Amino acid sequence: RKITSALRSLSNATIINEEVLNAMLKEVCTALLEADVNIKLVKQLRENVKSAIDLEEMASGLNKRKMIQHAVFKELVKLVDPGVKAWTPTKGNVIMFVGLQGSGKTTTCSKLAYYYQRKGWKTCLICADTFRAGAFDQLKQNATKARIPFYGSYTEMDPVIIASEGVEKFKNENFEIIIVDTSGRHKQEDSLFEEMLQVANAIQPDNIVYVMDASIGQACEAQAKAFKDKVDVASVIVTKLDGHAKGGGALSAVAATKSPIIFIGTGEHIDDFEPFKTQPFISKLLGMGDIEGLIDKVNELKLDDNEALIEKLKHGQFTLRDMYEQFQNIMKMGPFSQILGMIPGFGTDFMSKGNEQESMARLKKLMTIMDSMNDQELDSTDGAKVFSKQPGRIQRVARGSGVSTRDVQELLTQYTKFAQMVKKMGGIKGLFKGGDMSKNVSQSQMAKLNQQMAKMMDPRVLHHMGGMAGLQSMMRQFQ
């Protein structure tokens, strides 16, 4: 982390340089391992780094110092992965999740099931981690949470029996994506690696995904190689990226398998699978990984918005209180930080640099306070005014929400300031309009008028541009 500062540390004057570099190199290089300490690797990176230099230059029209970076960043992905895709599915798919004990296989299976169910696929989760007795209940529970059926293939006397029951269940329930969660095993455990190979020959899986923990060290190389040579494995999932491990194990695994890193496991939540690839680490690693984030901004916003799936709610109809909708975005804008919040203040904030979620838990508490308000107060052109004229109302809201009188006046003051950027012009009213007749539909409107014909990547781009509640301000400033 504090090397990620070497970044801006470091950007400053350009009166000095190569030294700046090698230090930074070594500096960065220090904060890691470094070469020869836990492995061996690094020499390689710190090499390849060099290699380039004495073979290149920043295309003119661009300060070197920067370039260096693209390369740094660039080698960093290179050392813990570089990614684009995603898997190509067919009519019928059967995948295995494999790896060391504790890498995150069972959770990843559930994540994959949720991810693809949303894509319209029939998933079936197969709990075949028999050694751990508690293990079947674990996936069973996850299955319930994501609503993906779960077969506990606990007739292990022959793989053949497992195949039989999986086939029967997939047919009767029209399953088209079978995810086989296997028990964790050491890459050197002959009996268990042999069992995995056997299971593979019987089940005829398309994809064999090695689930690798982002914190994995020097042995990532041998682990990836062993699983690859014994069970043919193509493709990887890098888990626990929501931690602060650098993730170099990804580069090690990529280098010896030549199989692309399909997905990134971020958090422990069922929907925290994504996709980003090496770009975000690159971004990671830099101070822009609150630029890169605002992928998350976009990517996960189109989420808004389609068919009102958002449960009508979200920013949508809840969008009336806009104020209610702004609270959801701030809710999902917590949620969790894409970039640094420009915010417009400092006043103690006392570091106040970050907590998520804690930031999202705050929006939720404000929502519970507005849950005590009524339609008149919620749809009022100026809800703060309705309480200035009838202060008795403040007392009721506070009673119902288990909050104090001051807390409600605070919410009201915050709403006032919110409605004012929102007001920043024109405020609430022009944003609501546009906002009640537009917002999504008022990017939707736009979505419907300037989609059509755009592929899905194109529509997400457009949705991010919308997003913008000043893109209109950008466009008019442009003019």
Binding site: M342, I343, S352, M421, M468, A469
Partner: peptide
Amino acid sequence: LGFPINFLTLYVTVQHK
């Protein structure tokens, strides 16, 4: 829009203990 609105929302929550 997303910047201030989100940043003011952010700056407010931190400041108000």
